[PDB]
Amino acid sequence: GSSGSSGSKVWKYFGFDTNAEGCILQWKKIYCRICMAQIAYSGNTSNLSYHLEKNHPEEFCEFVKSNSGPSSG
Ligand SMILES: [Zn+2]
């Protein structure tokens, strides 16, 4: 999933920069560079955001830009 991305936005924060004999980069492993934390990847990028929603409330907002009527929350 590299050649042809719709609009990956929830990745700029969680970017895995690894390269070596093992090249774990291939595996499904993600870590928050911002807080040098480790966050496993799930079926979808649902946790990716959640992590911030609680961790970094500043980044979450900037990433949470919905253009529509207000929801309960
Ligand atoms: Zn973080």
Q: If you had to describe this structure to a student in words, what would you say it looks like?
A:
The protein is mostly helical. The protein has one domain. It is built from two helices and two strands, in the order E-E-H-H. It has helices at 46-54, 57-63, and strands at 31-32, 37-38. The protein has a two-stranded antiparallel sheet. Helix 1 (46-54) crosses helix 2. Bound molecules: zinc ion. Residues 32, 34-35, 37, 55-56 line the site of zinc ion. Homodimer and homomultimer. Homodimerization is necessary for protein nuclear localization and DNA binding. Interacts with KPNB1; required for nuclear import of ZBED1/hDREF. Interacts with CHD3/Mi2-alpha. Interacts with SUMO1. Interacts with UBE2I/UBC9. Zn(2+) binds at residues 32, 35, 51, 56.
Q: What's this, in brief?
A:
By secondary structure, the chain is mainly alpha-helical.
Which features does this protein show?
73 residues; mainly alpha; two-stranded antiparallel sheet; 2 helices; 2 strands; 22% helix; binds zinc ion; transcription; Zinc finger BED domain containing protein 1; dREF homolog; nppsfa
